[PDB]
Amino acid sequence: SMSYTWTGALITPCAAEESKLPINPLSNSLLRHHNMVYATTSRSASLRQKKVTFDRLQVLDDHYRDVLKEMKAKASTVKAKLLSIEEACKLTPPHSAKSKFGYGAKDVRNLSSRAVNHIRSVWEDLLEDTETPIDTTIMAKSEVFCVQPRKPARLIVFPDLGVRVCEKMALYDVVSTLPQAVMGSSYGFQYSPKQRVEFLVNTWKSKKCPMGFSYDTRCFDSTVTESDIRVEESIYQCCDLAPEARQAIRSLTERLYIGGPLTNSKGQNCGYRRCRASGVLTTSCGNTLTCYLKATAACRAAKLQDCTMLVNGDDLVVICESAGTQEDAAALRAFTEAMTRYSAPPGDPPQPEYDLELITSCSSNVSVAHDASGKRVYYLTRDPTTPLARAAWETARHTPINSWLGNIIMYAPTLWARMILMTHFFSILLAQEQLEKALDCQIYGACYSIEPLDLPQIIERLHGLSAFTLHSYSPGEINRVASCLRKLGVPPLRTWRHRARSVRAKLLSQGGRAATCGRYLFNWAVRTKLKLTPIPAASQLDLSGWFVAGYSGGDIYHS
Numbered sequence: 001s002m003s004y005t006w007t008g009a010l011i012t013p014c015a016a017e018e019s020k021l022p023i024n025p026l027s028n029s030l031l032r033h034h035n036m037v038y039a040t041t042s043r044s045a046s047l048r049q050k051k052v053t054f055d056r057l058q059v060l061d062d063h064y065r066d067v068l069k070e071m072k073a074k075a076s077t078v079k080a081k082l083l084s085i086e087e088a089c090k091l092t093p094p095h096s097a098k099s100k101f102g103y104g105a106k107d108v109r110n111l112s113s114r115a116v117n118h119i120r121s122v123w124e125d126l127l128e129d130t131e132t133p134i135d136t137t138i139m140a141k142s143e144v145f146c147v148q149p150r151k152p153a154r155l156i157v158f159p160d161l162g163v164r165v166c167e168k169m170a171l172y173d174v175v176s177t178l179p180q181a182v183m184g185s186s187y188g189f190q191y192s193p194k195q196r197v198e199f200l201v202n203t204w205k206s207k208k209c210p211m212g213f214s215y216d217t218r219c220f221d222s223t224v225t226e227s228d229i230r231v232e233e234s235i236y237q238c239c240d241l242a243p244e245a246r247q248a249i250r251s252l253t254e255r256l257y258i259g260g261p262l263t264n265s266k267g268q269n270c271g272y273r274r275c276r277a278s279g280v281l282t283t284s285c286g287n288t289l290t291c292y293l294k295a296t297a298a299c300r301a302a303k304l305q306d307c308t309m310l311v312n313g314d315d316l317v318v319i320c321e322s323a324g325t326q327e328d329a330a331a332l333r334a335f336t337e338a339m340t341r342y343s344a345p346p347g348d349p350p351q352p353e354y355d356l357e358l359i360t361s362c363s364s365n366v367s368v369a370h371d372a373s374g375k376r377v378y379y380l381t382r383d384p385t386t387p388l389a390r391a392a393w394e395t396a397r398h399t400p401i402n403s404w405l406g407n408i409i410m411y412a413p414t415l416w417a418r419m420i421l422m423t424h425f426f427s428i429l430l431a432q433e434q435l436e437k438a439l440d441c442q443i444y445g446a447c448y449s450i451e452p453l454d455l456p457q458i459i460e461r462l463h464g465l466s467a468f469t470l471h472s473y474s475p476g477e478i479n480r481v482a483s484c485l486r487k488l489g490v491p492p493l494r495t496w497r498h499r500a501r502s503v504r505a506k507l508l509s510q511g512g513r514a515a516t517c518g519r520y521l522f523n524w525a526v527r528t529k530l531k532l533t534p535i536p537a538a539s540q541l542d543l544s545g546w547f548v549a550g551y552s553g554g555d556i557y558h559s
């Protein structure tokens with residue numbers, strides 16, 4: 001059937017939309033070619049709609065069914081608990097879109113009488129009505145990018161706040177535990193960046209002659225069929241569930257997950273959806289399961305040997321045993337045709353890779369640098385173009401989420417996050433006298449509140465002390481970073497080094513945690529290095545819950 005149906009009503013904004021980077025004294029010191037930075041707006045909504053609207057084709061075979069049974073078997077070991085209204089409310093972000101029933105996020109987090117009572121009626125409704133399609137709002141997402149040698153806005157579909165709270169009650173535990181139970185080491189969200197690298201590298205080393213490839217599905221959400229979603233539910237149903245949870249999952253599946261009506265910001269019937277909605281709790285878990293299911297089955301059909309999958313939502317990377325150049329290319333092609341039959345056609349044609357550093361997955365790749373002792377150390381990196389464009393936008397405007405903080409945390413070892421993001425933002429936080437102020441950022445979609453001053457401990461725990469001493473980066477990584485700086489008009493190393501030494505001195509003179517930020521975060525900027533010993537507070541950090549599951553679009557806040 002058609003992934004979408006359109007009435008003709010337009011996808012409308014809910015207020016003025018900013019598309020250009022404001023000329024700002026601070027963002028200008030980070031990146032000079034401000035005209036290359038833009039934010040998508042609903043003005044490109046029509047371009048996106050045309051791309052995600054099409055009739056899906058799906059043909060299932062014995063491999064698909066075999067893998068599904070294997071998956072259901074593992075799901076059978078799980079026991080999901082069901083959250084109380086109180087617990088679900090606590091998971092709601094303070095900035096989550098308000099309900100249309102007289103209350104907002106704050107009321108939800110504060111267990112307000114009106115919010116709680118409405119949520120209860122919505123839950124009871126899920127238990128009683130098993131068919132009425134649940135209403136959803138559709139909006140053009142506002143994201144920042146750098147022009148290319150432009151990207152139309154993505155579309156986000158989400159239900160009301162009341163319904164979102166109910167989703168948590170019925171499925172939060174499910175989506176946080178089942179993927180790992182079912183997919184094991186292949187579930188990407190269980191790994192911190194360091195752990196992901198370790199998994200990728202160890203997997204690559206376990207092969208006689210390794211071959212790997214990333215698979216980009218063309219607009220994955222729209223390729224998800226009604227069948228995929230019911231298959232997905234069938235997996236969840238293998239869990240031991242409370243009666244009410246079981247019914248809520250059944251109702252939520254038929255009333256919301258498989259599709260439903262689309263309403264714009266003005267309250268106008270925009271159309272109908274028959275594919276994956278981006279803004280629901282099950283989106284990450286659902287896409288991961290579906291991608292893993294089709295890919296694992298496709299690998300068998302294609303006869304790829306000893307495959308090892310790493311899946312993060314719709315992002316997939318496969319590493320297998322090479323059977324030779326011609327054969328690998330033929331097997332990959334067979335893989336793609338199998339995936340196409342499963343309704344997961346490729347966007348970018350896949351290509352076999354024999355060099356791990358050249359494989360991009362989750363917009364990132366593994367690369368090598370060296371610590372003070374000279375030992376090779378692997379770490380996760382990526383082209384810094386988008387991260388920098390966003391750092392610049394976030395420096396000029398006030399944004400709910402601070403992608404820059406998230407990028408420093410996740411890419412602490414990289415040459416660009418250290419030289420640029422750390423230097424730029426600490427210099428600004430110092431001046432504005434806001435080093436103590438906790439800021440929100442996202443990690444695998446979930447929102448977190450983090451104080452800049454704890455970055456040293458955070459980085460040591462997550463990446464190890466070598467994150468503060470890496471040097472001699474790969475020629476490929478250096479060329480990529482350099483060409484990026486020239487493109488965006490970003491100051492050269494010498495300028496950043498000078499600014500870093502200055503920021504570093506100001507931090508040291510302050511003592512306390514600030515000085516700790518000076519010593520570790522900026523040791524790369526001075527010649528007379530300082531002995532960097534284990535940070536006490538790093539051995540007392542509970543960062544486990546950071547890498548458990550994916551929640552993009554799930555409206556999840558972890559306090």
Ligand SMILES: Cc1ccc(S(=O)(=O)Nc2ccc(Oc3ccccc3)cc2C(=O)O)cc1
Binds near residue numbers: 419472473474482492
């Ligand atoms: C965090 C960081 C770590 C080490 C340094 S360094 O000055 O000690 N060494 C380098 C200096 C320049 C360079 O190549 C670049 C070219 C353009 C832009 C940035 C770096 C690469 C390296 C390195 O250690 O590999 C600078 C920044």
